[PDB]
Design a protein around this ligand. Structure first.
Ligand SMILES: [Zn+2]
Lengths: 1118, 96, 146
């Protein structure tokens, strides 16, 4: 078995090339990072493999940069090290159940030095609870599954440039050393040919000013920069002569009007760029500066601040960039090339992931803790001080909890299905806190860059206004320590391809010559041809003689994402439809049944197992007993492992999650094998739709303009039924007038309406609820007014008192139905954590079962969306020569216009998978199947094939497969050599005059359903202040009437309609009351007059002492 | 009002005209009373100068029927009418 | 340029005397509401602070004139009255605007006319109405054109 996975059902594959390396664990980006931050042995073992001499945890690094704290006497100090975590509070499922946060407590070992005494006191400090990541790669904050998204930033470093001038028509080279945190330094050559440094956006001064300011005598400047002419000219053009005269000059251009001392200037120059605390490069910035200047390449420098020798190296580099010199060398440093950098290139864009992002919040919170500890150690007594009293845990707990609450980069997990979640976690986002703005990013930042090849997917992106700003991590790509994205290659030493693979970054790859995975290879690894096609430098493609070939790609699908990877015949679509296809797959609703696609990519078993929603088997053993609730496995060791299966969970996006034990009882299960089938998964496989019999033609304008005709058989068989689970929540919070309560009796509601509720006040489980019904019965203690006299007689005749309580009971919003599957309640007595000031919270789950119908969205895999405009009854669909009616009728006119014919090929191949085939192999193998794999010569009906991306069935192979389709159970053969069949018309009963193209396709039911997206509103509830109808889909708000609809109105000349919309339908209260009343009464609606708004405009203009009068025809006021 | 405006014109006011628009003078800085949350006598919210709170009601409570339209109560001086005039009557301040 | 400004006042029939205020109007109480929120908190409008301010400085000035005082104190109080009403009519138009809570400029009375949210812009942008809905459209080739 070529497949790694233990018991995976096998797909014959149209694979022409063997894959050298297997696809890594997909959630690696999400787990690795966090594993590094906590500091765990697993990450320590990885660092053992890399051979890193420095083994350090993210927490440990933040503790080194804080320690030690010391008082300005130095007489008392406090440092702490060695974090360690503990067992998690509780298991994950319980945390999703009880609304808490799955986390672990965390200590440190802190000590208090004392100098005058000489005694140091050590102890264990606790540091709140710390949110910990689960094995699925997600965080559980407040009971909901969230996800931290990685972020693309420009790394710290030293960027040279060249900008053309408008006035003098000549380009000017400017550098900037941009650090991790600390003041911007920058150097720049002028149109007047004068270098100028600029320090924290100060006014330019000559650059030999700062050079002299560090301690450079005039003679050393003369000899070091002597070969350069513009540097010499800038040593003349300067005015300040001498060392302190330049520190004084720098202080005098730093701030104007401040007392200038020589010691404070010499103190701030080394305070802003050489002080360890005030300014910092990270390991990213330090390493990159070392690599760009070619200095200190042998030894790993632990010092992470800017140095002076470095700054002189930079100014010499800038002068080199003005020269046009290819090579620089510095004393004490290896040689490097000289070229201007580019901010778009992916070797400069580092990516900071969950570990970095959580580390930053721990850091900032920690700083806010350090100030408090410093003041606290000055005030307290030296004898009565303990390391317990100084450290305050609260300001950091606050920082983390606010990161997971508020931070843009920790969203709700998109859980439409498995593929959507797995894609959500592999995301490269450009937006957020600490990055370029959405309006600030130019149009070049947003497009594809020739260095993304194999790291970020060029195809996959969002379609709206965030295009280019969110990409997705490629299949094979993985992120190294510093924060760059690497892709694996294999290396060809001398025209022979190795089996050892090296992960390259974007800037290291620019230095070689990389050949593509389609190069013809012998069995030794010898190159079959004289010339190979290769990628050289940036955005260059060219043929090369076989000796200049250094590396080669892992797999022909190295450059795509995980969602893109599941589109059969993807090299046949265009990028637009490919984009809508990738995009749309992550909005497919999981059905009640799953089947895998008859034609798919090798990608779906791997994707499914990784995205975490199938239950896998940890060890190997034998199935003890199967339930609907749990599987019990018996290890060969002797110990038993029991797995739960959560049944009908409300996932985040209202769809249903269900786990179904797939194995039969008493079986032998391998370690790491699928055992249960999550939502959307069949047999451990990403199944986002169903197989349907499609025929391509227009059919009496019911599918005209991209709508779709569905066969009624689907609605009767439940082929496209889904389960959607809602939840509603209401609670009992205290008001000063009294404490509300949730209780069965409710004033002025008949007994039949209250039959569903029990004695508790909550509806019993399983009672189908039509909208408007009561789910939870609560009453507020009504605000104490006087009892109305008219109401004293009205209530007096019957004798029913309006009690001290009004009725605020939870009701069913309109457009929902289904059963009440489960209720849940939180109380003060149970000891449940509650929000501050509420005594009981109650939620209720209602689950309906949707059949497909008009106005639901369907989509294939190549971005061919569509709404169902009709559902014919079974006996009207154009049916096949043997009486199988087609299921869906997809129009012809949208295939050649979209310019994506992958769907036609998917249909042909699909029909061949349905019927099975047997090539003519008795006479010999026919030529068109020479390179066809041997397992493919002969398939059994309904056999599932696989065709990878950029390496699937070719044309000649498909066409040849359409001649060998197995004949039908009646004896006959239904589709011809072209793929077209003869159809009978269901209504007429004649045969159609030509052959139509039938076949199978894989269709998915998207998440745009007509029951969600329907709102109407005759009247409703308004908003006190804006006095317009209150918006929202959940309060059946009114729909908005913008400005271009008014211009339409006025182009018609429809004065009365537009005057009606703008006045009685929105703003005037008098108007709406009069119109409503007149309609109910059955009289004419009043003719629209002057808005009540007018008199308010006049009262406000009368407020500003202006005087506005209205003139009549004659000229007299009114 | 008549539906016929030929045109609108704007101009400067006058102290003798600003006194004409007004219904009282606000002479106390204070807004609604803190205890009962009724407006405070002769300030920026009072019912005497501007309008009654609820429809057809004076301040002290000597009239809450609708039978009396347009009467001005002689114990506190509010006028029982629609509460909508609460946004059509303007105050005035006289500066020393 | 002088002639234009001057001849205006001649054609108007309006005396230029109306450029010094002997009285100030107060906007009706509703267009600067103080409504009580759901949680017991009071939510008010910003103009209330400005009118209150001018009322204060006025009453204090008049009692001061009653008592008798030095010229520097009466001139300072007059000054504060003029600046106060000045910020009530249009804030941040002369020196520092006034801020109420947390260094937040107050919305003036000329603030109710200008801007994207002013009274002149209100009807041009468009609002949500009544008797309306929306949904997904499918084709139906059975229907007549009307
Ligand atoms: Zn009264």
């Amino acid at each position: 078995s070529n497949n790694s996975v233990p018991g995976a059902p096998n797909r014959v594959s149209f694979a022409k090339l063997r894959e050298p390396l297997e696809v890594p664990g997909l959630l690696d980006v999400q787990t690795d990072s966090f594993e590094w931050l906590i500091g765990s042995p697993r990450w320590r073992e990885s660092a053992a493999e890399r051979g890193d001499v420095n083994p350090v945890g993210g927490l440990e690094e933040v503790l080194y940069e804080l320690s030690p704290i010391e008082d300005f006497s130095g007489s008392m100090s406090l440092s702490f090290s060695d974090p360690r975590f503990d067992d998690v509070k509780a298991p994950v499922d319980e945390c999703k159940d009880k609304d808490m946060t799955y986390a672990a407590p965390l200590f440190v070992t802190a000590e208090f030095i004392n100098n005058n005494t000489g005694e140091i006191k050590s102890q264990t400090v606790f540091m709140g609870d710390f949110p910990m990541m689960t094995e699925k790669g997600t965080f559980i904050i407040n009971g909901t599954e969230r996800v931290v998204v990685s972020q693309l930033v420009r790394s710290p470093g030293v960027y040279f440039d060249e900008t053309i001038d408008k006035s003098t028509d000549k380009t000017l080279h400017s550098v900037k050393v941009i650090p991790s945190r600390g003041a911007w330094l920058e150097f720049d050559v002028d149109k007047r040919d004068t270098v100028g440094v600029r320090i924290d956006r100060k006014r330019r001064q000559p650059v030999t000013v700062l050079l002299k300011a560090l301690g450079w005598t005039s003679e050393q400047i003369v000899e070091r920069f002597g070969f350069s002419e513009i540097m010499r000219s800038t040593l003349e053009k300067d005015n300040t002569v001498g060392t302190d005269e330049a520190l004084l000059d720098i202080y005098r251009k730093l701030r104007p009007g401040e007392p200038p001392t020589k010691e404070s200037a010499q103190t701030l120059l080394e305070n802003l760029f050489f002080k360890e605390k005030r300014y910092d490069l990270a390991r990213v910035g330090r390493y990159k500066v070392n690599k760009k200047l070619g200095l200190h390449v042998g030894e790993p420098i632990t010092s992470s601040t800017l140095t002076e020798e470095d700054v002189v190296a930079t100014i010499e580099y800038l002068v080199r960039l003005h020269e046009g010199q290819t090579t620089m060398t510095v004393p004490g440093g290896v040689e490097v090339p000289v070229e201007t950098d580019d901010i778009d290139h992916f070797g400069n864009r580092r990516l900071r992931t969950v570990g970095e992002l959580i580390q930053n919040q721990i850091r900032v919170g920690m700083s806010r803790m350090e100030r408090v500890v410093r003041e606290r150690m000055t005030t307290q007594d030296v004898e009565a001080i303990t390391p317990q009293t100084l450290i305050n845990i609260r300001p950091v707990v606050a920082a983390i909890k606010e990161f997971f609450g508020t931070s843009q980069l920790s969203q709700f997990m998109d859980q439409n299905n498995p593929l959507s979640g797995l894609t959500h976690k592999r995301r490269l986002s450009a937006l957020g806190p600490g990055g370029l703005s959405r309006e600030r990013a130019g149009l070049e930042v947003r497009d594809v860059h020739p260095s993304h090849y194999g790291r970020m997917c060029p195809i996959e992106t969002p379609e709206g206004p965030n295009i280019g700003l969110i990409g997705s991590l490629s299949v094979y790509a993985r992120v190294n320590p510093f924060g760059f994205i690497e892709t694996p290659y294999r290396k060809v030493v001398d025209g022979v391809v190795s089996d050892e693979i090296v992960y390259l970054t974007a800037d290291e790859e620019d230095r070689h010559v990389v050949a593509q995975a389609n190069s013809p290879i012998d069995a030794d690894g010898r190159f079959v041809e004289p010339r190979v096609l290769v990628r050289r430098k940036a955005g260059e493609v060219e043929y090369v003689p076989s000796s200049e070939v250094d590396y080669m790609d892992v797999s022909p699908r190295q450059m795509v994402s995980v969602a893109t990877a599941m589109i059969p015949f993807l090299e046949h679509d265009d990028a637009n439809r490919a984009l809508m296809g990738a995009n749309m797959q992550r909005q497919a609703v999981p059905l009640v049944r799953s089947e895998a696609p008859l034609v798919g990519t090798g990608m779906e078993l791997r994707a499914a197992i990784d995205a975490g929603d199938v239950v896998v088997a940890e060890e190997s053993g034998v199935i003890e007993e199967v339930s609907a609730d749990y599987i019990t496995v018996m290890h060969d060791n002797g110990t038993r492992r029991t797995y739960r299966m959560r049944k009908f969970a409300r996932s985040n996006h209202g769809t249903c999650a269900n786990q179904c034990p797939i194995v039969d009882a008493g079986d032998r299960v391998e370690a790491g094998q699928v055992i249960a089938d999550g939502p959307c998964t069949d047999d451990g496989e990403m199944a986002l739709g169903k197989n349907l019999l499609v025929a391509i033609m227009p059919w009496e304008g019911h599918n005209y303009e991209d709508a779709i005709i569905l066969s009624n058989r689907l609605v009767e068989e439940d082929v496209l039924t889904s389960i959607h689970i809602e939840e509603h929540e209401i609670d009992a919070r205290d008001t000063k007038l009294g404490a509300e309560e949730i209780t069965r009796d409710i004033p002025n509601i008949s007994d039949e309406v209250l039959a569903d509720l029990d004695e508790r006040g909550i509806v019993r489980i399983g009672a189908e609820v039509r909208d408007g019904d009561i789910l939870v019965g609560k009453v507020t203690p009504k605000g104490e007014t006087e009892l109305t006299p008219e109401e004293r007689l009205l209530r007096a005749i019957f004798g029913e008192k309006a009690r001290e309580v009004r009725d605020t009971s939870l009701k069913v919003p309109h457009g929902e139905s289904g059963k009440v599957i489960g209720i849940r309640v939180f109380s003060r007595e149970d000891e449940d954590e509650l929000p501050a000031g509420v005594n009981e919270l109650v939620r209720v789950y209602v689950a309906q079962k949707r059949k497909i119908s008009d106005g639901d969205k369907l989509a294939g895999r190549h971005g061919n969306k569509g709404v169902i405009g009709k559902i014919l009854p079974v006996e009207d669909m154009p049916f096949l020569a043997d009486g199988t009616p087609v299921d869906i009728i997809l129009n012809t006119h949208g295939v050649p216009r979209r310019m994506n014919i992958g769907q036609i090929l998917e249909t042909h191949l699909g029909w061949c998978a349905h019927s099975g085939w047997k090539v003519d192999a008795a006479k010999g193998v026919p030529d068109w199947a020479a390179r066809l794999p041997d397992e493919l010569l002969e398939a059994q009906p309904n056999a599932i094939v696989s065709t990878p991306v950029f390496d699937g069935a070719q044309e000649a192979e498909l066409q040849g497969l359409l001649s060998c389709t197995l004949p039908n159970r009646d004896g006959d053969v239904l589709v011809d050599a072209d793929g077209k069949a003869m159809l009978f018309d269901g209504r007429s009963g004649e045969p159609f005059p030509y052959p139509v193209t039938v076949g199978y396709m894989y269709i998915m039911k998207l998440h745009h359903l007509v029951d969600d997206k329907i709102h109407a509103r005759s009247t409703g509830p308004y908003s006190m202040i804006t006095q317009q109808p209150l918006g929202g889909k959940a309060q059946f708000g009114g729909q908005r009437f913008g400005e271009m609809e008014c211009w339409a109105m006025q182009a018609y000349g429809a004065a009365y309609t537009l005057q009606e919309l703008l006045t009685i339908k929105s703003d005037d209260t008098v108007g709406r009351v009069k119109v409503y009343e007149a309609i109910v009464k059955g009289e004419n609606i009043p003719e629209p007059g002057i808005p009540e708004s007018f008199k308010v405009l006049l009262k406000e203009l009368q407020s500003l002492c202006l005087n506005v009068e209205v003139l009549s025809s004659d000229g007299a006021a009114i | 009002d008549v539906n016929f405006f030929d045109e609108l014109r704007i101009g400067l006011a006058t102290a003798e005209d600003i006194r004409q628009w007004s219904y009282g003078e606000v002479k106390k800085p204070e807004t609604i009373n803190y205890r009962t949350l009724k407006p405070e006598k002769d300030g920026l919210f009072c019912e005497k100068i501007f309008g009654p709170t609820r429809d057809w009601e004076c301040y002290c409570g000597k009239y809450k029927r609708v039978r009396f339209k347009g009467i001005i109560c002689e114990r506190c001086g509010v006028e029982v009418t629609r509460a909508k005039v609460r946004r059509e009557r303007m105050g005035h301040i006289e500066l020393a | 340029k002088r002639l234009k400004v001057v001849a205006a006042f001649q054609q108007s029939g309006n005396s230029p005397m109306g450029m010094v205020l002997d009285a100030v109007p107060v906007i009706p109480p509703e267009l600067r509401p103080m409504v009580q929120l759901d949680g017991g908190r009071f939510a008010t409008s910003d103009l209330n602070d400005l009118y209150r301010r001018v009322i204060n400085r006025n009453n204090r000035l008049k009692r001061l004139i009653d008592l008798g005082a030095p010229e520097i104190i009466v001139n300072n109080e007059k000054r504060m009255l003029q600046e106060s009403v000045d910020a009530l009519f249009d804030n941040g138009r002369r020196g520092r605007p006034v801020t109420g809570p947390g260094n937040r400029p107050l919305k003036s009375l000329s603030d109710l006319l200008k801007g994207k949210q002013g009274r002149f812009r209100q009807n041009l942008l468009g609002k949500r109405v009544d008797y309306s809905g929306r949904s997904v459209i499918v084709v139906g080739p059975q229907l007549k054109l009307h």
